[PDB]
Structures are given as C-alpha cells and as structure tokens.
Design a protein around this ligand. Structure first.
Ligand SMILES: Nc1ncnc2c1ncn2[C@@H]1O[C@H](COP(=O)(O)OP(=O)(O)NP(=O)(O)O)[C@@H](O)[C@H]1O
Ligand SMILES: OC[C@H]1O[C@@H](O)[C@H](O)[C@@H](O)[C@@H]1O
Ligand SMILES: [K+]
Ligand SMILES: [Mg+2]
Length: 447
C-alpha cells in the first residue's frame, strides 16, 4: 500500500518536526548570544562568560615580503605550506603538504603531538630542499593571548585530548619539539585561529572583510571589535580582532530549551561532554552522527529499514557528515542515497531513501539556522558599535560544511538576512585561507 508508505512518512515528519526552530526562536538565540558576547569582553564577567571573546592581537592598523612557512592544526589533518608574500600584500600557495595525524598523537601526550608535528615539518623541508623561514601557526583552539606570538591553550576541542598542553604556551610547545629534534630551525613569529586566518586572507581582494567564520569540523567566528570594547587589552584606538569561541555557547545552559535527545547522546559519547554545545549543533564532527542517531530512532519506531539496523548503522561515526551532503545532493531518482545506505549494509526501499533525506535536511537546516543566529548576532553588534544606519560588511568563510554541503550555504544566508535588517552582508569563501592568512599575519609581526 502506498497508503501505508505515506503513513510511515507522516509519522517520520511528526518526529522530525522537533528539529524546527521558529524565527522567534532564532531571535532568542541571537539575543542570548549577543548577551554572552557582551559578557566575554568585560573584565567583570569574562571568567564566567561561556563565550570567551578572546583578543587575538591582530589589529586594524598593522609588513615584510619573501618566503613564509604556514602550519595548520585543527582537523584530522596537519597541513604545512610554503607561501610567497608580496606587494597591500598578496599571498600565494606555492608548496603544500598535509599529513594524517595518528590516533595516538591526538589523544596521547603533548610531546607525542608536537613531536609528530616537527617530524612533519622536517619531511616537508626535505621534500623541498629548504631545511630559516618566518613561521606562522594556524592553531584552531581557544588560546588566551598575551601577544601575537604567545598564548596558552585554554582547552582542547574537536576530539583533541593530548595531555600536558592545556594551560601552557602553545608556541613554546612547538619550539620545544623542534629543538628536541634539532635538524631544522624556524622563527615562530605568529599564532592565529583559523577564523582569523580566513578573515585576513580575504582582505587583499575585499577590504570590507572584518569577519571570519569556520563551518568545518568545528564552528567559530571572529570579528574586528572596537579597542574601546575590548576591556582585556590596554588602549582605545582603532580595532582588534576578537575570537568569539562561540562553540562554547550553551555550556552554561543557554541552549537547554533547544537541545534534543540526539544532542544529549552526541555530547555524552564525545571527547568533551558538556562542552562546545552550540558547535555540536552545527559542526561536521557531529552532524552525521546526529543523523545516524535520528535514523536509529526511526528504525526503533519501525519506520525505517523494516525495523532492522545494520552492524554499520549501529557503529559510531559510520554515517559520515559527507554522506549528509551527498544524500541532499540527490536529484530525485534516489541513486546517491541508495548507494550510501547499501555500503552501510542496508537494503533500502524507495521510501527508506526519502526518509533518510528528510532526516539529513532536518539536521542540516537546524545547523544552518542555529549558525545564522550567531553570525547575525555578531554583525548586528558591529552595526550598533559603529556609526551607521546601514552596515556593509564582508564575511570570509571556510570549512567543508559551508563549502561542500549543497544547501547549507543558501539556507544559512537567507536566515542571516532575515535577522540582519539594515545590513548588507557579502559572503566570500576563502581560497587556502589558513596558509595565506597565517603567512600574512606573520609578515606583519615579522618586525
Ligand atoms: N562533503 C562534505 N560535506 C559536509 N561535510 C564534510 C564533507 N566532507 C567532509 N566533511 C566534514 O567536515 C569536517 C572536515 O572539514 P574541513 O573544513 O576540512 O575541516 P576544518 O575546516 O579544519 N574544521 P575546523 O578546524 O573544525 O573548522 C569533518 O567533520 C567531516 O566530517
Ligand atoms: O576550527 C573551527 C573552530 O573549532 C572550534 O571548536 C575551536 O575551538 C575554534 O578555535 C575553531 O575556530
Ligand atoms: K581596551
Ligand atoms: Mg580550519
């Protein structure tokens, strides 16, 4: 019966309705987010604020030229690259290599981690016969800076758990590991978040870019704040980039009304339970798993796969986030959806496929909408801080979710636009943002 297939589909929709957020829900999240950003900037409230609004010491009024080395650590892969900076300043990726980080190095000791990093740097300097450049470190974790070249790791995020790194100077850890190996020498001149790197890389082609955003494994944003509002740094003149660390929004209960069973389960099986909760609604580290967990509930309610979940479907992380993009790239014939579930040991019908799509759309739309509330909060804050009825601003964006998901981008922009009246927001995707941004920040600091 088509009548019974449609009754299965109606029941799924009732369950999936839970992922909906009304426009007023988003405005509420936005206001709460703006409130947390206020708190993180102020001396009185900074320690308790879950959105830490960390000074980066990358300023509005900041350079050198020549060969630069860029390091990038934040995802499953560590990337090294040679970049040429020339006359403002252009930058170009000329040599590049990425390395897979062994499990033991992400979850072992800091020494292991940075030993592996240094090994990677020497292989790269080998593969290009260049083993003393100025070195920029894109390091995508919450860091409390004392300057551009010095700051301590507040805490690991995104599954990182190397011991002996939290509360230590990250540049120091890198310098130490390089010294231990002692077969090359590098001038470590700057450390930057990936958001900051992305923002800076978009500046040569568009000077209106004063916001950087990452929607990848993790989710975070930075922006050019007025120095007068950055209470943690001395001076009131011009602007300084702030790393919001908005992923930890929710860690003090601010999203509790909105968290679902699937979110609690994802948080509980994560490396950092109770932390990075806003990020866990959005990031690619967690999105596919969120979908896997919806699909499991649906098989349990007898609405999917004849009520039977395969060994693969019951394994953690098996529904990869790229599968969410692929499913939602489907043209209507169900071929992409079928092949994904086939490789998961499942024997999907035609309606099974349509339900999996609906599950993915519900998770990724919520991610798009939740993300939109955070960005709209930042851009609205900036408009009010500045002196204009209409703010024109560019946002530099990187990450596989924003970049590769076929509809996230579009759902996200629309929602951001609803929430930012009297703002004209241009979105640009960075091209090698982290390498070129890191190199560009190095060249300034190279003084
Ligand atoms: N085609 C895809 N569509 C959506 N997500 C994907 C896709 N391919 C990989 N991913 C996910 O995106 C993440 C990797 O994205 P990527 O942008 O390369 O990392 P990243 O930007 O370093 N993350 P982060 O450092 O947390 O900002 C992983 O969690 C993957 O599961
Ligand atoms: O890589 C994207 C983001 O992931 C977050 O989890 C990290 O804490 C941020 O520093 C980073 O900007
Ligand atoms: K100040
Ligand atoms: Mg990154």
């Amino acid at each position: 019966n088509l009548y019974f297939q449609g009754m299965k589909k109606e029941k799924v929709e009732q369950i999936l309705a839970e992922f909906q957020l009304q426009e007023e829900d988003l405005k509420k999240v936005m206001r709460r987010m703006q409130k947390e950003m206020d708190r993180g900037l102020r001396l009185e409230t900074h320690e308790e604020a879950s959105v830490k609004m960390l000074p980066t010491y990358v300023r509005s009024t900041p350079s050198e030229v020549g060969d630069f080395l860029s390091l990038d650590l934040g995802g499953t892969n560590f990337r090294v690259m040679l970049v040429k900076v020339g006359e403002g300043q252009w930058s170009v990726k000329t040599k590049h290599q990425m390395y897979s980080i062994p499990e033991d190095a992400m979850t072992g000791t800091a020494e292991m981690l940075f030993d592996y990093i240094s090994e990677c740097i020497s292989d790269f300097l080998d593969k290009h016969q260049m083993k003393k450049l100025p070195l920029g470190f894109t390091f995508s974790f919450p860091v409390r800076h004392e300057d551009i070249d010095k700051g301590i790791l507040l805490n690991w995020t995104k599954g990182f758990k190397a011991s002996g790194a939290e509360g230590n100077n990250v540049v120091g850890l890198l310098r130490d590991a390089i010294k231990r190996r002692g077969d090359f020498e590098m001038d470590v001149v700057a450390m930057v978040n990936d958001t900051v790197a992305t923002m800076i890389s978009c500046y040569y082609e568009d000077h209106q870019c004063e916001v950087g955003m990452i929607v990848g494994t993790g989710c975070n944003a930075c922006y050019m704040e007025e120095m007068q509002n950055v209470e943690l740094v001395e001076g009131d003149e011009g602007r300084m980039c702030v790393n919001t660390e908005w992923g930890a929004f929710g860690d003090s209960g601010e999203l509790d009304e909105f968290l679902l069973e699937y979110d609690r389960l994802v948080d509980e099986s994560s490396a950092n339970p109770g932390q990075q909760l806003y990020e866990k609604l959005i990031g690619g580290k967690y999105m596919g798993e969120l979908v896997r967990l919806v699909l499991l509930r649906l098989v349990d309610e007898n609405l999917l796969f004849h009520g039977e979940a395969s060994e693969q479907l019951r394994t953690r992380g098996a529904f990869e986030t790229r599968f969410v993009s692929q499913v939602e790239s489907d043209t209507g014939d169900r071929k992409q959806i079928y092949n994904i579930l086939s490789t998961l040991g499942l024997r999907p019908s035609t309606t099974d496929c349509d339900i999996v799509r609906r599950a993915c759309e519900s998770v990724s739309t919520r991610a798009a909408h939740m993300c939109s509330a955070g960005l709209a909060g930042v851009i609205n804050r900036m408009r009010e801080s500045r002196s204009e009825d209409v703010m024109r601003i560019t946002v530099g964006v990187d990450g596989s979710v924003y970049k590769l998901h076929p509809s996230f981008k579009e759902r996200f922009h629309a929602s951001v636009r609803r929430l930012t009246p009297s703002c004209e927001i241009t979105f640009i995707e960075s091209e090698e943002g982290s390498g070129r941004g890191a190199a560009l920040v190095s060249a300034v600091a190279c003084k």
